[PDB]
């Protein structure tokens, strides 16, 4: 039997999440740093692995190198042989320890009445707009890099055409109300702080006093938390604790709440997202990766989509955990949450199978749609 847990994360201070232009990686762009609102699912996976190791006092790689003969296999059966790697994107299992499945990170509002938890999702890019095509072989055709598709007709659902100057759907996060969808501006959920720090001591006598850096620190609005669902193999309980989730020493409070045995966390996430389902499009709830975007384009009439960049930290059980981290040599482009895939008249199953072809990414919390 497998334990099912709801993992709530409360920020105890201002938090940071790494991007590609981090504090010291590149060339003269390495003293201004910006933060991503959500951590990568690899951050959640590594958090779980770190907490599991610490619970069993198996934390290793202290500021010296040692060997672990008789605890290599305990480590392997507890956390897995290696970190989350996108090279194994097609495998049928996470290749990790007791961790079976992680739902995508969700934004949860906790009303100060312990009444219910409202889950906020990105606003679908088609919200409030009616997108229609002419499936006939008539005129008004579009060519997306040589592929011929029917022209989209976007009207507000309030015969005025789409206005690019009145478009703000990418700035909103939505939750279920009573009959309409409550829309929260993304600037209300997150607040931004630019911290300027220096190094007091001046070394080597060269030109100095310019050693000032800027970091963007994010904070969640009051009564807002992060959450995700995790399935743990056998009996490997997770203890509530104070944890780190990326960034410049960001501290979160882990609350582990148990849900019923006969439950599917994928089903629970889809049940939460059920209020956004329109049967003419595919809503991309979690970041989605496809090896060929051209084939996905051929299987749809219009993508109202965006991109995010993905890069991992690749560490093995024996890696030097204290030093320069080895990051994935390749960066991958994922479809942003809130993107809608307008499938052809009869090919929803085709695009669904294309997206579910990566079951490893599915178990990690990616390629989740509704």
């Amino acid at each position: 039997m497998n334990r099912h847990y709801l993992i709530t994360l409360t920020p105890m201070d201002w938090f940071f999440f790494g991007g590609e232009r981090t504090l010291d990686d590149g060339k003269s762009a390495d003293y201004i740093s910006h933060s991503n609102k959500f951590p990568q699912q690899s951050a959640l996976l590594g958090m779980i692995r770190y907490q599991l190791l610490k619970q069993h006092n198996l934390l290793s790689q202290f500021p010296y190198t040692e060997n672990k003969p008789t605890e290599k296999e305990i480590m392997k059966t507890l956390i897995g042989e290696q970190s989350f790697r996108m090279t194994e994107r097609k495998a049928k299992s996470l290749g990790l320890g007791v961790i079976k499945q992680i739902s995508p990170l969700m934004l949860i509002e906790c009303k100060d009445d312990t009444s219910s938890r409202s889950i906020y999702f990105p606003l679908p890019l088609d919200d409030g707009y009616k997108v229609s095509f002419n499936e006939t072989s008539n005129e008004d055709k579009v060519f997306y890099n040589g592929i011929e598709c029917p022209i989209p007709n976007v009207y507000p659902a309030s015969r005025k055409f789409f206005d690019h100057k009145t478009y703000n759907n990418y700035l909103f996060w939505c939750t279920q109300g009573n009959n309409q969808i409550k829309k929260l501006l993304s600037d209300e959920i997150w607040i931004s702080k630019m911290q300027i720090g220096i190094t007091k001591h001046v070394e080597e006598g060269e030109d100095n006093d310019k050693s000032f850096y800027k970091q963007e620190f994010l904070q969640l609005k009051k009564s807002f938390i992060y959450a995700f669902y995790i399935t743990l193999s056998g009996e490997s309980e997770l203890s509530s604790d104070i944890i780190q989730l990326g960034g410049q020493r960001s501290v979160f409070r882990m609350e582990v709440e148990s849900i019923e045995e006969n439950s599917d966390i994928q089903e629970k996430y889809q049940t939460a997202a059920q209020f956004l389902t329109q049967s003419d499009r595919l809503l991309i709830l979690s970041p989605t990766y496809v090896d060929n975007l051209k084939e996905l384009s051929a299987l749809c009439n219009f993508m109202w989509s965006d991109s995010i960049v993905f890069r991992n930290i690749q560490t093995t059980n024996a890696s030097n955990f204290y030093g320069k981290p080895i990051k994935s040599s390749s960066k991958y482009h994922f479809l942003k949450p809130g993107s809608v895939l307008y499938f052809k008249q009869g090919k929803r199953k085709e695009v669904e199978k294309l997206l579910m072809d990566y079951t490893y990414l599915r178990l990690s919390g990616y390629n989740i749609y509704i």
């Binding site: 105890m12 500021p63 702080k193 630019m194 720090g197 007091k200 604790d241 104070i242 501290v251 204290y322």
Partner: protein, 279 residues
Amino acid sequence: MTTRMYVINTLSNMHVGSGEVNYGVIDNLIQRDSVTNLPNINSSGLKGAIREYFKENEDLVRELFGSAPRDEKTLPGKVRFFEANLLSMPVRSDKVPFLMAISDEVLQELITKMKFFNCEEATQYISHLSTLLDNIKTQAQGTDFAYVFDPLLQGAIIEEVSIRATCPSHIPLQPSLKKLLGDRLVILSHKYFSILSDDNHLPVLSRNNLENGQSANLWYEQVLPRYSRLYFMLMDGNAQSEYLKKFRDTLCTPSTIIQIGANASIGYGYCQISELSPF
């Protein structure tokens, strides 16, 4: 991991540079909280001050605070510092040289932070502070209030806001609450405290640079008043017990004075550090 609350009790004027876009009368401003706009110290400043004090013991610094910048090998820190929030501030009176001013909102935020962080001595402190706040709210009944607890201090006039302090006999102040919040304490509405801690009522000092007997430059400096109290939270990532105990003992010994902020050579920001005493 044992979260601990430390009080600061600055022994001199504190200037921690904000560095943000300044356009007003005062050229050098102090760091203020984004949300409450009360004076505060960034955890970067706290870590820097404590690491500078302990820099002569290299092993302790490497264990707790981490590796120095521009070092080939990078070691993570084991203590997490949280930002220091203003607890009480000296306000000027007429019966006594000064009074220690705390707002009811500062008290409530302290209660919430202790409940959230689970400080080691949080239980009794939270209970007694909650009782004090409830008694204060019952006495005020939604009106502006300025409550002193020593019967002698009755009738004290806070200078900048011409408020006369009253002494409700029903409200008991425990000795440990007095230790935490300070002596000669007045509990105000947050409007009064915000007025007293704003840019117009904080001490502004004039400075100039003399070249051959004539002033070359002139600027005005904002300083946190002497004897102010700030609290912060420290989290030990299960660091080595001996280094942790040495660090805590050195931090709590009376002979140890920490410099935080600018103007170190003219004695700005010199403070002690006090752990939360058991109630």
